[PDB]
């Protein structure tokens, strides 16, 4: 992949775990994917504009892939 692949394909990785947790009202997992979608969001923005990432801030969170 190149590099704005690989931030979509793991923010849609996590979208998808945050969607499975509020399908079982996980109310902390829900939210601790939810801020880790939107920081893999904001990261995104900023690629877009060919601006610094703070890849060092991106969680890769173990146990999720």
């Known amino acids: 992949t ?3 692949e690989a931030l979509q394909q793991r923010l849609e990785k996590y979208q998808s775990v945050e ?3 509020k399908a079982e009202n996980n ?3 829900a939210r601790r994917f939810g801020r880790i979608v939107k920081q893999y969001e904001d990261a995104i923005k900023l690629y877009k504009a ?3 990432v703070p890849y060092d801030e991106l969680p890769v969170p173990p146990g999720f892939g």
Request: proline content about 8%; charged content about 15%.
């Open 19 to 21: 969607a499975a947790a």
């Open 2 to 4: 190149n590099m704005l």
């Open 27 to 29: 109310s902390g997992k």
């Open 50 to 52: 060919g601006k610094p």
